[PDB]
């Protein structure tokens, strides 16, 4: 995390908690975008004078660029940089994790990127701490909604329908 550590008690506004091998984070409902680590909002689709400072993506806003004539661009929030057209923590610029993603280490006072892996993998000290070693992760999510439990979906833990339910879970 770049801010406070996300926990099982964190409320994701217009979002929901997900778990990987080394952290929790908020994922947005439908097509919303993160304006911070705990808040999702609608995004604008074009950056100009009318949409300045509006969210244009995960951890990005339309920012006034002080160029030859003034222009506007979707620019990552403080602490983030564009890598493959998505905003990731600056200290993750050069970090490659494979079956996972880079996060800031909330246990380190020096800002440092570490790999947090898909459910199934763990940091491999033999392989530059990338997500190449197979390993188990205990799910921390409570999943108190109707007929819901922590399930692994596409490499991440999320609360989902129990055995025999689809769409609230019926």
């Amino acid at each position: 995390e770049t801010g406070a550590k996300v926990t099982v008690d964190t409320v994701c506004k217009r979002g929901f908690l997900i778990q990987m091998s080394g952290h929790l984070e908020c994922k947005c409902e439908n097509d919303l975008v993160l304006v911070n680590e705990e808040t999702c909002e609608e995004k604008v689709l074009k950056c100009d004078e009318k949409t300045v400072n509006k969210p244009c993506g995960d951890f990005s806003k339309c920012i006034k660029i002080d160029g030859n004539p003034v222009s506007y661009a979707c620019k990552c929030n403080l602490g983030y940089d564009m890598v493959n057209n998505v905003c990731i923590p600056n200290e993750c610029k050069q970090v490659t994790c494979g079956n996972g993603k880079c996060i800031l280490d909330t246990s380190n006072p020096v800002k440092t990127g570490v790999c947090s892996c898909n459910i199934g993998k763990v940091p491999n000290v033999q392989d530059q701490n990338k997500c190449s070693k197979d390993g188990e992760t205990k799910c921390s999510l409570k999943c108190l909604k109707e007929q819901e439990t922590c399930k692994a979906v596409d490499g991440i833990y999320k609360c989902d329908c129990k055995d025999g339910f689809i769409i609230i879970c019926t």
Epitope: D31, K43, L45, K50, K54
Partner: antibody, heavy 117, light 109 residues
């Protein structure tokens, strides 16, 4: 910046499906939310629904069961279909768009649709 | 129907007059309220967005203020080309666009 131009059938028979097309020139369609808005003669404006090229849809709940919309970026077309039309659907139909999700700063000229036998 | 109000429903003013129009949204919408000008036979034209921001190229005599539910639109000095119906337009938490009933401004000459 984009320029919008509606085209429609003029007449549509009652209970049949109204099909409209908005031809777009200028910026990429992916940079805008695309909406249809209609206005009966001497009446106010009714927003019908909003979509984006990403596949997101945001139809007015009053018309969701009758209306669908789509974008064809290959031919720069933004379309809507309104099922089971009646005389209450006679109106000027506008296409409109914006990079913002909460207003409309680009408008077509409107096309008048008359439901009639 | 979701209820919005605009006052007055119509008005007749002289060139140079100060014109003030009010709009009340159906709920607290913060600043998600926009003002459009629809001249006869033409599409609506956005003049004010986000309650108080002037659209690029719109004359400085147009302005808007307000937040929450109660909003005003002001033409500081009415000009002949300003005759039109003016609509406020809200965007609520259900992502629904609703236009107000509109205010028609005519000119006394």
């Amino acid at each position: 910046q984009v320029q919008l131009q509606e085209s429609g059938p003029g007449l549509v028979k009652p209970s049949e499906t109204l099909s409209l097309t908005c031809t777009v020139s200028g910026d990429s369609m992916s940079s805008y939310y695309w909406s249809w808005i209609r206005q009966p003669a001497g009446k106010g404006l009714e927003w019908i629904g909003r979509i984006s090229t990403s596949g997101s849809t945001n139809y007015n709940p009053s018309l969701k069961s009758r209306v669908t919309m789509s974008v064809d970026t290959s031919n720069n077309h933004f379309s809507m279909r309104l099922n089971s039309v009646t005389a209450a659907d006679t109106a000027v139909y506008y296409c409109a768009c914006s990079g913002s999700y909460s207003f409309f700063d680009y408008w077509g000229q409107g096309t008048l649709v008359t439901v009639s036998s | 129907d979701i209820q919005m109000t605009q006052s007055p429903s119509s008005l007749s003013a002289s060139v140079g007059d100060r014109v003030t129009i009010t709009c009340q949204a159906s709920q607290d919408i913060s600043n998600f309220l926009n003002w459009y000008q629809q001249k006869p036979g033409k599409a609506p034209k956005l003049l004010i967005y986000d309650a108080s921001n002037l659209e690029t190229g719109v004359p400085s005599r147009f302005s808007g203020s307000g937040s929450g539910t109660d909003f005003t639109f002001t033409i500081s000095s009415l000009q002949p080309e300003d005759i039109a119906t003016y609509y406020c337009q809200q965007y609520d938490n259900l992502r629904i666009f609703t236009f107000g009933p509109g205010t028609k401004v005519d000119i006394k000459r």
